[PDB]
Design a protein around this ligand. Structure first.
Ligand SMILES: NC(=O)C1=CN([C@@H]2O[C@H](COP(=O)(O)OP(=O)(O)OC[C@H]3O[C@@H](n4cnc5c(N)ncnc54)[C@H](OP(=O)(O)O)[C@@H]3O)[C@@H](O)[C@H]2O)C=CC1
Ligand SMILES: [Zn+2]
Lengths: 146, 129, 337, 86, 137, 116, 96, 207
């Protein structure tokens, strides 16, 4: 039902700050020239990027390649994941390794610091399915959510 | 067998030059080869039997006079039907279309037991009918 | 950009160019080409017209449904001007006449009307204004046409400072009054020429080149507030040009000299006609005006238009004037600057 | 001008990646100790030819094929990357 | 501000919590002057004199394969190993847990409906928050 | 096998190439008459360059049967022109005179729309 | 009913009206904007509620086969009328 | 019988079946399949090499005498290796009977012209060439018949778009009719009409 948010508050034109400090519509030519001018004058740690929660892989790699060409490595995401130890060197460190369908084969589940009902509702439905049909035992460390 | 004298041709079959399609709608198009998903609003499965080929969606804009949906894409409505995935791929190759194939998604067999509704010691016992 | 003027489509008849253009003088030679180019790409074109609706019928097929709108207007009524411009983003002034009538003289068409359009367009909030002047506009010219052009050009620049002023040379094309003018001199045995067609150098420009230049000016943010000169690639002697014109039309060419005084009476003699004169004193003075060289002004190449050689398009214009091997003999061109 | 990132691609089962798999199991932990702040992205994918990617300053990248390498060849291939810039 | 496209308006790759790569398909083109997001960056790189080496969607996906090959294996889950190696590096630096108890950011249904820009702009999601808070009335 | 097929006219590319060159000669000699007969505003050079451009775009074919059909179609096109079944509009449709030049670089396409 | 926008253009019963900067209103210059002035929403609201003496009532829109498909309307709720989904007529149970 | 149900004619069904076997026994070199429909129409499916021999036998044989070529057309079925099905519908005035002869071809395989057998076939084969792009060998005058001169493509192929690729208008600048890529003020609206429930069990196909 959230698809109706796609019809509201949409960004439809490039915008730059005018002399009064207000965002005003402009052309793609003009907006990119302003951005390109700044990017050509900064290098290294002077340039950084943050990627939000809805960005696609094609956009992520393109931005990383662009910032790498000014020798910047500050490509960040809003969502934290600890970098101590292996960090992101090993995929197994940050994946759901059992897989969603593997929940139906488990015989005990320990949930830690998560409300899967709201963070991943379809994943929580898979747990309930196994709780119902496989008599799965579920334990929770955290707040006692329903 | 035949009285007609055949020839040997090892070329890959390609008919792009003799189909009359403009260059734009051969090389810049992406064909999608898939078995349509069941419309979740209904239980009938009869529309999931055949393979389909469709093309990448392109711009539609509002007609200034009436607000109708205009298009400049001649392939916007073209949908082809195929018996097998291999037939669909063969058709796309000889026409020079780049394509992606999506494997068919058959529902997995389920274990259904009415008696389970009334289990003595399991959670499948229903609280209502 | 308001959501209705964002461009959509692929530049064809059913696309949305985002241009909303009021084209004054759309019913004439240059106007038909301008409207056609706006219509091709899916622009909204407002066509104020003074003439009969029957005289605007050739414009109707040039746009998709609803894309050509026709309004009545009067050059002396500023309210009719306001109704036609108040929704437009660009106003193009192609109003002009090669002769004077009882109701309108050269001051009216080239000074008062262009100033009225410019002033109303500025008050209406129109963003772009394109005004067609003349390459040889000059207040010292013997041609009253060219003197009014100079005065009108100055007033438009004062009224609408961000206006784009285009100053073309004599324009040739199917419906031109240039190559067709010379071809129709043959319709009388005499072929007069001030001096012998010497001392007059011409640099004519192709109609489509002017049209593309105007269209590219609408789309070019740089072009605002500038004055352009649209000229062809090759300069010619008036005698060579007319000789070439007759050669392409397969006509017998009989030159004979004349001074202005004997060339002004023939001009006066046909000025008596209650319609478009075949010729007039002013037309002769303009034809025998050497085309100015104005290297301080940008031209067609600054707008990304390649000037079309006259030799590549003369047949297109003059084929209808033929009586019924294509040696042609290209006319001699003055050495380039 | 120095090294910025290391990526190791390999298959989970193919014999052509056996040496790369051995290197990870035996030597990756020690490699990561010595290079605490160097990204060493290990990315497994079935049926790929193993490769070593090195990204240097300003987006320049080198790749070295590791197909059929031993664990020791992989070690030397990584040593050259760590030592020689580009 | 550079207007990009939403997930309904582009063919883009997303990797889910299992590591399975999947791609959206264009349902409608982006509104107004908005553009596909990787094309904005590719266009920016050309203006800046740092042109990226891909001009089509297939080319930028070939680039994805050079960084992480699993990103173009659509609808496939690629297993990841080396838990022991990860656990060895994890024990090298000992960090102390904080005392504060684990509290999820979402405790009740009212916190479910609005969690991103699309849902925060949804008028339907706003009615849902009102219903669970105020009531049916 | 499945590569043993029925020919159209040519049993191999060398036979097919002969027909191509014969068709090209026929078109080459027709252009001057076409420009005169249809009273076109293009030069004979422009017409012959257009003929060469049409032949070049199919230079990569290696299947004799495909080449046979290209020649068969090319000959039908020639017959339409020689017999004056075409009108001047049909002949001028090879030159796309009213179509504006669509941009080809990445940036120019990026500015105008969404198509690759 | 028919109201007007600040620019002077009439608002249709569907709420349509070109805003101030919309060039498309040029199509109405020297001509007119066709608007139907019998707003069905206002007309149906003028109709009185029928009081009936049963829990369920049926409506076919009047005129038999010249109306709409016959539907049956439940009137158990006393906090609202029963409305016909086809023609918008309203019914209310008297007493109960 | 049932007032709303079409009555069956079992005598004609048996007669057509027996004649179908008769044809298959006489021309085994070419006949691949013979079938009779529930509404009593006989179809002979043949190898494309058999066009002239089979049609000649059906026209001239004393027990056939199919003198009239009622219709000749093609059907495009993209899922088949030989996508084009060529259908000959013949009529016998002597025996007051009809028969359908079918064969196949692909985009590059010529079919033999049947003009020697039926002079009616001349224009029918030009139409098949024009609309489907099937070439007919030794046709006296094979060229487009229905499409515009210089038209590109074969519009009855299932993968040719309904509205084509180009459209026409008069252009005042060049003073002639010109062709340009097709743009539609209103796009044709594709409807998905098929029910997801099977309608005809008798025609069900193996999974
Ligand atoms: N053609 C050339 O060689 C050159 C032309 N120019 C300028 O270009 C512009 C147009 O050229 P061209 O198109 O050849 O001129 P045309 O005479 O071909 O068309 C003139 C236009 O002006 C309109 N017009 C004339 N007088 C009046 C008036 N009194 N009130 C209202 N409308 C009027 C006419 O409308 P109606 O049809 O109602 O009379 C017509 O649409 C003119 O300004 C001309 O000076 C500049 C340099 C050279
Ligand atoms: Zn009712």
């Amino acid at each position: 039902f959230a698809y109706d948010g796609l019809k509201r508050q949409r960004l439809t034109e490039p915008m730059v700050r005018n002399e009064k400090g207000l965002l005003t519509h402009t052309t793609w030519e003009d907006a990119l020239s302003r951005v390109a001018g700044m990017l050509q004058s900064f290098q290294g740690n002077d340039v950084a990027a943050i990627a939000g929660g809805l960005v696609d892989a094609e956009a992520l790699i393109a931005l990383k390649d662009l910032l790498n060409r000014v020798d910047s490595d500050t490509l960040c995401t809003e969502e934290v994941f600890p970098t101590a130890g292996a960090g992101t060197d090993l995929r197994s460190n940050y994946l759901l390794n059992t897989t969603i369908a593997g929940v139906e084969e488990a015989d005990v589940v320990l949930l830690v610091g998560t409300n899967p009902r709201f963070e991943a509702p379809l994943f929580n439905a898979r747990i309930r399915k196994s709780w119902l049909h496989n008599d799965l035992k579920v334990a929770l460390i955290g707040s006692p959510v329903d | 067998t035949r009285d007609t004298q055949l020839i040997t041709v090892d070329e890959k079959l390609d008919i792009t030059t003799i189909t009359g399609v403009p260059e734009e709608h051969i090389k810049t198009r992406k064909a999608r080869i898939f078995v349509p998903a069941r419309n979740n609003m209904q239980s009938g499965v009869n529309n999931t039997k055949k393979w389909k080929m469709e093309f990448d969606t392109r711009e539609r804009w509002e007609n200034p006079l009436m607000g109708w949906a205009s298009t400049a894409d001649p392939l916007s409505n073209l949908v082809l039907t195929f018996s097998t995935k291999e037939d669909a791929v063969a058709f796309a190759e000889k026409n020079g279309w780049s394509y992606d194939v999506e494997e068919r998604k058959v529902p997995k067999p389920k274990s259904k037991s009415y008696g389970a509704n009334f289990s003595w010691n399991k959670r499948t016992r229903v609280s209502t009918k | 950009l308001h959501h209705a003027v964002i461009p959509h489509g692929k530049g064809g008849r059913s696309s949305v160019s985002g241009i909303v253009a009021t084209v004054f003088g759309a019913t004439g030679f240059l106007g038909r080409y301008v409207v056609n180019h706006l219509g091709r790409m899916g622009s909204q074109v407002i066509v104020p017209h003074r003439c009969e609706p029957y005289d605007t019928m050739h414009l109707r097929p040039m746009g998709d449904l609803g894309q050509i709108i026709f309004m009545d207007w009067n050059g002396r009524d500023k309210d009719s001007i306001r109704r036609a411009v108040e929704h437009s983003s660009v106003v193009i002034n192609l109003v002009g006449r090669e002769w004077e009538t009882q109701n309108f003289d050269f001051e009216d068409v080239f000074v008062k009307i262009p100033q009225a359009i410019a002033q109303v367009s500025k008050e209406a909030g129109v963003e772009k204004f394109i005004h067609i002047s003349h390459l040889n506009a000059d207040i010292k010219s013997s041609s009253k046409y060219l003197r009014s052009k100079a005065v009108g050009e100055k007033e438009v620049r004062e009224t609408f400072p961000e206006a784009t002023i285009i100053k073309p040379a004599e324009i040739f094309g199917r419906e031109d009054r240039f190559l067709n003018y010379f071809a129709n001199i043959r319709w009388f045995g005499g072929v007069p020429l001030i001096s012998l067609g010497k001392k007059t150098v011409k640099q004519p420009v192709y109609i489509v080149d002017v049209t593309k230049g105007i269209i590219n000016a609408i789309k070019d943010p740089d072009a605002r507030g500038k004055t352009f000169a649209f000229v062809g690639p090759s300069r010619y002697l008036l005698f060579d040009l007319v000789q070439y014109v007759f050669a392409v039309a397969h006509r017998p060419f009989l030159p004979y000299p004349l001074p202005h005084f004997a060339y002004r009476w023939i001009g006066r003699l046909f000025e008596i006609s209650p319609f478009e004169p075949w010729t007039t004193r002013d037309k002769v003075e303009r034809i025998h005006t050497t085309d100015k060289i104005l290297p301080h002004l940008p031209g067609l190449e600054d707008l990304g238009v390649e000037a079309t050689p006259l030799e590549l398009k003369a047949i297109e214009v003059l084929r209808r004037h033929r009586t019924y091997i294509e040696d042609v003999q290209p006319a001699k061109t003055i050495p380039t600057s | 001008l120095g090294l910025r990132e290391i990526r190791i691609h390999l298959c989970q089962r193919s014999p052509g990646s056996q040496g790369v798999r051995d290197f990870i199991e035996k030597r990756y932990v020690e490699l990561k100790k010595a290079n605490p702040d160097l990204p060493i992205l290990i990315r497994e994918c079935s049926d790929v030819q193993p490769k070593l990617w090195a990204r240097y300053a300003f987006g320049q990248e080198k790749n070295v094929s590791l197909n059929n390498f031993s664990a020791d060849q992989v070690t030397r291939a990584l040593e050259n990357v760590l030592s020689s810039k580009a | 501000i550079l207007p990009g496209a939403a997930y309904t308006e582009k063919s883009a790759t997303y990797v889910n919590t299992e590591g399975r790569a999947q791609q959206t398909k264009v349902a409608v083109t982006p509104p107004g002057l908005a553009r596909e997001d990787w094309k904005i960056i590719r266009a920016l790189s050309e203006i800046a004199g740092m042109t990226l080496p891909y001009d089509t969607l297939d080319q930028v996906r070939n680039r994805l394969e050079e960084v992480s090959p699993n990103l173009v294996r659509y609808d496939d889950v690629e297993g990841a190993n080396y838990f022991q190696q990860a656990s060895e590096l994890s024990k090298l630096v000992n960090q102390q847990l904080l005392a504060d108890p684990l509290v999820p950011p979402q405790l009740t249904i009212k916190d479910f409906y609005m969690t991103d820009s699309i849902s925060r702009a949804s008028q339907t999601m706003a009615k849902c928050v009102k219903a669970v808070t105020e009531g049916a009335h | 096998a499945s590569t043993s097929v029925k020919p159209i006219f040519s049993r191999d590319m060398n036979e097919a190439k002969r027909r191509v060159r014969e068709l090209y000669r026929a078109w080459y000699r027709e252009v001057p008459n076409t420009v005169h007969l249809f009273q076109l505003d293009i030069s004979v050079k422009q017409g012959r360059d257009k003929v060469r451009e049409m032949f070049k775009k199919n230079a990569h074919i290696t299947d004799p049967r495909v080449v046979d059909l290209l020649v068969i179609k090319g000959k039908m096109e020639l017959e339409e022109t020689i017999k004056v079944w075409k009108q001047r509009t049909h002949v001028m449709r090879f030159f796309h005179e009213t179509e504006a030049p669509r941009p080809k670089d990445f940036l120019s396409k990026f500015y105008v729309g969404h198509d690759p | 009913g028919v109201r007007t926008s600040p620019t002077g253009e009439k608002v249709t019963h569907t709420g349509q009206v070109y805003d101030d900067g919309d060039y498309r209103k040029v199509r109405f210059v020297g001509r007119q904007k066709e608007v139907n002035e019998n707003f069905a929403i206002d007309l149906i609201a003028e109709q009185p509620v029928s009081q009936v003496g049963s829990r369920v009532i049926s409506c076919d829109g009047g005129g038999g086969a010249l109306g709409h498909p016959r539907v049956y309307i439940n009137l158990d709720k006393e906090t609202k009328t029963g409305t016909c989904g086809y023609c918008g007529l309203q019914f209310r149970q008297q007493h109960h | 019988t049932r007032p709303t149900v079409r009555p069956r004619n079992d005598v004609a069904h048996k007669q057509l079946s027996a004649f179908g076997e008769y044809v298959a026994e006489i021309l085994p070199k070419y006949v691949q399949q013979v079938q009779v429909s529930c509404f009593n129409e006989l179809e002979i499916c043949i190898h494309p090499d058999g066009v002239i021999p089979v049609l000649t036998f059906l026209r001239d044989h004393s027990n056939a005498q199919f003198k009239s070529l009622a219709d000749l057309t093609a059907v495009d079925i993209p899922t088949r290796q030989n996508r084009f099905e060529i259908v000959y519908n013949l009529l016998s005035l002597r025996f007051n009977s009809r028969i359908r002869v079918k064969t196949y071809t692909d985009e590059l395989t010529p079919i033999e012209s049947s003009v020697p057998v039926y002079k009616a076939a001349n224009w029918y084969e030009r139409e098949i060439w024009d609309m489907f792009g099937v070439f007919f060998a030794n046709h006296p005058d094979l060229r487009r018949i229905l499409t515009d001169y210089g038209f590109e493509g074969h519009p009855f192929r299932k993968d040719f778009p309904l509205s084509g690729y180009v459209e026409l208008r008069y252009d005042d600048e060049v003073k002639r009719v010109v062709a340009e890529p097709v743009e539609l003020a209103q796009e044709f609206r594709k409807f998905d009409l098929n029910s997801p429930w099977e309608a005809f069990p008798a025609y069900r196909q193996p999974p």
